[PDB]
Design a protein around this ligand. Structure first.
Ligand SMILES: Nc1nc2c(ncn2[C@@H]2O[C@H](COP(=O)(O)OP(=O)(O)CP(=O)(O)O)[C@@H](O)[C@H]2O)c(=O)[nH]1
Lengths: 208, 605, 83, 99, 62
RNA sequence: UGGAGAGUUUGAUCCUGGCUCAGGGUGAACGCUGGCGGCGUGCCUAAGACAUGCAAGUCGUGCGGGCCGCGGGGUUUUACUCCGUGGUCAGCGGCGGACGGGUGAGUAACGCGUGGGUGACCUACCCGGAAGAGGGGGACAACCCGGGGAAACUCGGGCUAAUCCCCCAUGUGGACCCGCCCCUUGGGGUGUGUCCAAAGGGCUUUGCCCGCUUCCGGAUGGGCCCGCGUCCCAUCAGCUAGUUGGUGGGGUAAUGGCCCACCAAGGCGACGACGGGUAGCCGGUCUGAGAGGAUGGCCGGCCACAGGGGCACUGAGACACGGGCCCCACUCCUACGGGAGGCAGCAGUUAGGAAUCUUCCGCAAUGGGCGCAAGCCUGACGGAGCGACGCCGCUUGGAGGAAGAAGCCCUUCGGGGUGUAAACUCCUGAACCCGGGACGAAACCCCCGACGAGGGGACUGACGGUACCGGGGUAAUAGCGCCGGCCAACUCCGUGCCAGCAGCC
């Protein structure tokens, strides 16, 4: 499956807060906090050299990782950006995002990429028209979705749609905490995506 | 429909009219001519005609008519493999003991009826050969009446049944003095005397595929008696011991010699569904039937006979060789393949990767498997799995278990000799007022081998006794044979030379001939004494001339002395693996090279 | 015979058909004397059929015989309204 | 192990019988003809040329002569009637062969 | 000739098994080799890590 | 809109070159794991051999018949014909068996791709036009009789139908010779002569419909031909008698040495000829930044064989998979004389090997063959099963829960580690349960109206009661390779040139 296991263990692994578990691996405890260093039996072992490889692979890697979606598929879309004119670096970055699942989280609805994907498969999705559960299903030229029917009612629905009702999203994500509904605009673009990384690093890494 | 099935078996033995019973009755069963034997049954049944039973169906009337079935063993032996017929008590509702009016019954038959004596199934006496002259029929009836008077039946008594039969199809019967003909009363002496095995007029399918086989197309054959439900998958099924199972295909009953998938099964009869589950695999132990609801079904029931012939690989020098299967791999494939059909066979794993403890039933039983191995193309030695001297400081701590074999005080002095001569300590000879008398001789696995053979030659079949162990000993201090008249071994590979085998020829007997070119370790006759030697010759030397002539001399030489197997195997004692082949049978010592033998002996101390 | 019949295009459980012409010899899918309109009975597209009326006719001209279901499809099309 | 179709065969029997028979026919008579022309019996040679022409086509009818079968047949025929009958002898009943 | 890998073994003349082939420098002519479990030849008993090659299913850690 | 380099031959240096390695791809196998599904997907070796069960028939609007049922007598009954008819079974008479299904042995070739060619052609089941359809005869099966054989089959006699065969009219034509004019290698009109046309059937019937003959024609499908392009070895040099061509000549739908007689003898070759080795060509496909490598099954197209070898008739069309004659090997049967078999078709067997499924349901959809239609035939197809054999999607879980367990790992024993990892709370909610349930299909047919246009009616899906939707509903599988450098990933112990690992170093 889409990986599983002690992941704030990864919090430690890569560093750049893999708080990513969603909340506390996000506040006072998870490499992002606590022994911030690379975990392991030798995590506190003064590192060594970074093969230009260590480099590219590293970036490519945590990158893919923090999104909970197949390495294969990943590379796939990549290609797409590659075989679909336009700095594939960008195009892809975008594609990365535009994924349903990706979005499931992206819009506060979800608090972690994982719970996000989860819900996605589990229903409570409001595709433009009733719904879809493919924590994959891209997000066509910015569409609408949200706490589907019989969903606007689950305790966690609450936790979320509820504690939520506040903050704003990005320049490509339309947050309507109202009738719990999110709507996409257009290709997110470099800038509007915090999440530090680069691109080149990773694509070259691929080059063959 | 199940209240008309009548499946019975026609016990037998060393003689005299196997089937005979099953066959001939055709009248009845068949078109016209010819053959009418075989009969029936089976494949390579020339020299003899045992093993490979099944089944005796045919919708033959008589008329009478029907009963029905007419669908039971039907099984001789001369068993080989000791029991086998066991799969008969798991269906048959009566036995057809076919004795001879010339001498009566044979010890060989003193089992087929015994193993089921504690029944259960009123045997059906059948005196044959009465068509001849010398063969009192009234006297035989009296003798066959004491077979129970001392063992009970109890309702036998009857034991009536009580037939004589006749060559020209009498058969009597009934009994005396010409039946008809004889193809109109025998039927009555069965039906009217045969009941309808308690079958479940309804419920699920309870067919216990006792036996089982396979065909180069007709897949695997079920083979067994239906206990409940029947019968047209699929409609999966269920197996015993394990799940059993997915589903099923068809089912070829026993209409006489097929093959033909029973249009509709139910019970009583001895149907054998197929197709489901592809005959994968087969174990006359489970109890196929409906989908659970619910296990289980009996019985096992019994197969553990005795005997043991260690197996190995002809890792000798002569190459290479028999056909294409001499290594271990090829052999193994055969071993397991036998642990399927065989019911009286017990394959065991020893120490030597090239050794096996083939535990069969009778001394001859193991032969059937060996004889069939050659014709298939696979040379192997016999037995020959020895024991281990432990444990361990030490001197052979094996076990010791003896058992009398009545007796009939006509062997009390013929059996006490061997045992007493082989250390066979008679821990106790439980006697009785009847006439026989048990004799438990704590014998070890070292003094038990081959014993089964000679034993059957002492009491003449009428003598059974097994063992096991009482406590690991140390072998004592004496050798348990070790056989008399040392075995003549060779001194190298080459060929038999008249001038070589001529010299030392009066020093006993010879095996091979000429130019017979054997090798080292291979035996070529027995010594006039107990000592062993390793002569040689080819050479036969020497040629030639001139000069000159003309006289004289022209030594000849006698030939085997050859055989049997069967007549050479039991000849061993220490380590003379009877290397057999799909067209030949040799016998060499565990150590070919002479000087090599001394390495292991090496005696004290 | 020279006929206008269809072929199946799609996959597993999906069969649109090629409204085409060929000689009743080349497998329902064999090459085809020529392509002419397409149609799908499961529906989906609002555009579940395009049976070129003209070609229908022209071809039709000399002997063009059509599957029966063919003929009905084309007439429907409106290549068969004798007005 | 049974299949009606054999019919075919049997027919071949019938048909083939016939057709040959005829083919023979035209062959042989055409020949005979060729001969008359040869000897010089112009007149009769022609008559033949006739019965000929006739049967050739009769063949035409079915599957014995075909396409241009009968064609060459005739062409050959008449050209010959003439050539043969060209030892100075007059196209007597020059019917079958026009002016 | 080919290499008999796998720590422990057996197989006498009359022993099948097989070669997945594999040169094995340090002993010329070993242009191929066997593969534990092939028909006859069993597997590296009492083994633990890396086992597909030197074939041996995983142990129920019991 | 797209090309990354590392190892490796010294005491260290620079170079040529050899070899090693990375990644990419496959109708793979094997090791080890195996939860759902979807779709592509499935002998690439014995192209050996195969039990068995389906794989092509369909028409009484074609024809006589036999057997069967109904109704109806007939005749008193005797009898058993004859009718009407539902039919059944062949026989006969037509139209399909030449695609549809298989595989690639053979094949170095216009066989193939490609582009042209045909004054040397031919296509029945359809549309186009014009003309025709009027007398006479007759067969062999069916049946009965007769006979040989085990069978196979079967030889001799006797009568009968037809859209079968044959003769005679009528030619709009057509064919041929020959004749001419126009052309232009055997294309077009026509003139004198000769030869050839042709079946009915059924009904609301005097005509409505299936159909029939002659010819010009269309769409169509194919045939022969021709350019260029289509693999290695020259330690394969010299190759050639129908062989180079010519006269005429026979065959064929027509060419042509395709087969013949004569006659002249040239004809071929390094712009590689003769030979040998390899081989189904391609459209296309993996590959590579790239020209270029390789490959070319499952689609699709053209090509060849059908156990191997040969042939020919039936014919619009074959030398013909499930057709026929003859030899080789094979295999089976017998009364030994004598007969039957070819699954490189669907499923399926055994042998081979590393190896490759199912002896399924369904003709409801498409599709194809006979049918005036009703419909009949249809392991083409439509699915269906089974295989990690590939490709796509999906899951065994989310979330909060300690300076932080137990425990095992390291430990300079201070501590460090695996680890929020697990335990816990809420949670969601796969598998699995109840209810409903699909397009997929609308045509051929009813009724209207010229049976036509158009129109309204009628009927029918094995995938499935699954798919799907709804409500239900527990939290539910992980592993496999690597860890000296190339390369990313570190420590304890054993171990101590035994054991061993290696692509290289
Ligand atoms: N005259 C005569 N001969 C007989 C009769 N029964 C058997 N035989 C002969 O004796 C021989 C033995 O009979 P058979 O039944 O074949 O032996 P079996 O019992 O089947 C084999 P086994 O004795 O091992 O059980 C046969 O070859 C047969 O010819 C009989 O009733 N009359």
């Amino acid at each position: 499956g889409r990986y599983i296991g002690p992941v704030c263990r990864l919090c430690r692994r890569e560093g750049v807060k893999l708080y990513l578990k969603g909340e506390r691996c996000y506040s006072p405890k998870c490499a992002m906090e606590r022994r911030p260093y690379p975990p392991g039996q030798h995590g506190q072992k003064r590192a060594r050299r970074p093969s230009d490889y260590a480099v590219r692979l590293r970036e490519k890697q945590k990158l893919r990782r923090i999104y909970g979606i197949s390495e294969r598929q990943f590379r796939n879309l990549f290609e797409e950006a590659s075989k679909k004119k336009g700095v594939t670096g960008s195009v892809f970055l975008g594609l990365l995002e535009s994924r349903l699942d990706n979005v499931v989280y992206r819009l506060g609805f979800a608090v972690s990429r994982r719970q996000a994907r989860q819900l996605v498969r589990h229903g409570h999705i409001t595709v433009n028209g009733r719904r879809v559960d493919l924590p994959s299903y891209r997000v066509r030229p910015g569409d609408e979705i949200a706490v589907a029917e019989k969903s606007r009612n689950l305790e966690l629905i609450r936790q979320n749609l509820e504690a939520m009702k506040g903050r704003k999203v990005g320049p490509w994500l339309s947050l309507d905490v109202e009738g719990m509904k999110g709507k996409f605009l257009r290709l997110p673009d470099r800038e509007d995506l915090a999440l530090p990384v680069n691109e080149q690093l990773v694509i070259e890494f691929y080059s063959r | 429909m199940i209240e008309k099935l009548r499946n019975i078996a026609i016990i037998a033995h060393v003689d005299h009219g196997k089937t005979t019973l099953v066959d001939k009755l055709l009248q009845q069963s068949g078109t016209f001519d010819s053959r009418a034997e075989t009969q029936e049954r089976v494949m390579d049944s020339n020299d003899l005609e045992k093993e490979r039973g099944i089944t005796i169906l045919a919708k033959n009337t008589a008329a009478i008519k029907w009963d029905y079935r007419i669908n039971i063993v039907d099984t001789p032996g001369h068993a080989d493999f000791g029991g086998e017929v066991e799969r008969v008590m798991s269906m048959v509702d009566s036995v057809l003991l076919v004795v001879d009016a010339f001498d009566g019954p044979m010890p060989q038959t003193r089992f087929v009826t015994k193993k089921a004596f504690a029944y259960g199934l009123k045997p059906i006496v059948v005196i044959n050969k009465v068509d001849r002259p010398g063969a009192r029929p009234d006297w035989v009836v009296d003798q066959v009446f004491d077979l129970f008077v001392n063992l009970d039946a109890t309702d036998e008594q009857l034991d009536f049944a009580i037939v004589y039969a006749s060559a020209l199809n009498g058969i009597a019967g009934l009994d005396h003095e010409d039946m008809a003909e004889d193809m109109t009363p025998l039927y009555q002496a069965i039906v009217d005397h045969v009941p309808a095995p308690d079958v479940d007029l309804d419920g699920p399918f309870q067919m216990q595929i006792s036996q089982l086989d396979y065909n180069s197309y007709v897949g695997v054959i079920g083979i067994g008696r239906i206990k409940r439900g029947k019968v047209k998958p699929n409609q999966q099924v269920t197996i015993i011991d394990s799940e059993g199972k997915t589903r099923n295909a068809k089912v070829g009953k026993v209409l006489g010699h097929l093959g033909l998938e029973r249009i509709e099964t139910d019970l009583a009869e001895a149907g054998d569904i197929v197709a489901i589950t592809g005959l994968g695999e087969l174990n006359i132990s489970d109890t196929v039937c409906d989908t659970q609801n619910v296990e289980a079904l009996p019985a096992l029931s019994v197969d553990e006979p005795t005997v043991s012939m260690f197996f190995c690989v002809n890792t000798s020098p002569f190459c290479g060789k028999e056909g294409k299967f001499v290594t271990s791999r090829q052999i193994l494939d055969r071993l397991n393949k036998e642990l399927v059909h065989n019911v009286a066979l017990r394959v065991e794993e020893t120490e030597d990767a090239d050794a096996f403890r083939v535990s069969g039933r009778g001394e001859l039983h193991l032969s059937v498997l060996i004889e069939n191995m050659r014709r298939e193309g696979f040379e192997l030695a016999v037995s020959r799995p020895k024991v281990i001297f432990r444990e361990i400081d030490g001197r052979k701590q094996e076990p010791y278990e003896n058992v009398t074999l009545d007796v009939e005080e006509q062997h009390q002095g013929s059996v006490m000799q061997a045992l007493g001569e082989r250390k066979g300590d008679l821990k106790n000879m439980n006697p009785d007022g009847k006439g026989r008398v048990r004799l438990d001789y704590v014998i070890p696995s070292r003094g038990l081998i081959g014993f089964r053979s000679e034993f059957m030659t002492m009491t003449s079949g009428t003598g059974l006794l097994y063992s096991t162990f009482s406590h690991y000993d140390d072998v004592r201090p004496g050798e348990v044979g070790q056989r008399q008249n040392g075995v003549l071994i060779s001194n190298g590979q080459g060929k038999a030379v008249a001038f070589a085998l001529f010299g030392l020829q009066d020093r006993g007997k010879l095996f091979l001939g000429h130019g017979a070119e054997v090798y080292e370790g291979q035996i070529i006759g027995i010594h006039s004494r107990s000592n062993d030697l390793t002569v040689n010759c080819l050479t036969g030397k020497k040629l030639t001339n001139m000069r000159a002539s003309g006289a004289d001399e022209a030594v000849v030489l006698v030939p085997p002395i050859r055989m049997t197997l069967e007549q050479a195997l039991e000849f061993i004692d220490d380590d003379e693996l009877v290397e057999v082949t799909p067209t030949s049978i040799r016998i060499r010592k565990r150590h070919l090279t002479e000087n090599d033998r001394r390495r292991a002996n090496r005696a004290p101390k | 015979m020279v006929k206008i019949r269809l072929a199946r295009f799609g996959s597993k459980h999906n069969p649109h058909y090629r409204i085409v012409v060929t000689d009743a010899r080349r497998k329902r899918d064999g090459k085809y004397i020529e392509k002419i309109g397409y149609y799908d009975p499961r529906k989906t597209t609002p555009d579940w059929l395009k049976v070129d009326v003209e070609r229908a006719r022209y071809w039709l001209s000399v002997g063009a015989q059509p599957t029966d279901t063919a003929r009905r499809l084309l007439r429907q099309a409106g290549v068969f309204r004798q007005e | 192990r049974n299949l009606s179709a054999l019919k075919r065969h049997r027919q071949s029997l019938k048909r083939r019988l016939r057709n040959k028979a005829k083919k023979s026919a035209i062959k042989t008579l055409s020949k005979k003809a060729i001969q008359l022309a040869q000897e010089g019996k112009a007149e009769e040679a022609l008559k033949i040329m006739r019965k000929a022409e006739s049967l050739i086509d009769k063949a035409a009818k079915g599957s014995t002569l075909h396409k241009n079968a009968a064609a060459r047949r005739k062409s050959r025929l008449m050209r010959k009637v003439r050539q043969l009958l060209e030892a100075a002898g007059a196209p007597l009943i020059g019917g079958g062969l026009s002016a | 000739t080919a290499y008999i890998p796998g720590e422990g073994h057996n197989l006498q003349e009359h022993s099948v098994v097989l070669i997945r082939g594999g040169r094995v420098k340090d002993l010329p002519g070993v242009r191929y080799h066997i593969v534990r479990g092939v028909y006859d030849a069993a597997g590296v008993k009492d083994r633990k890590k890396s086992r597909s090659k030197y074939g041996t299913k995983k142990p129920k850690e019991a």
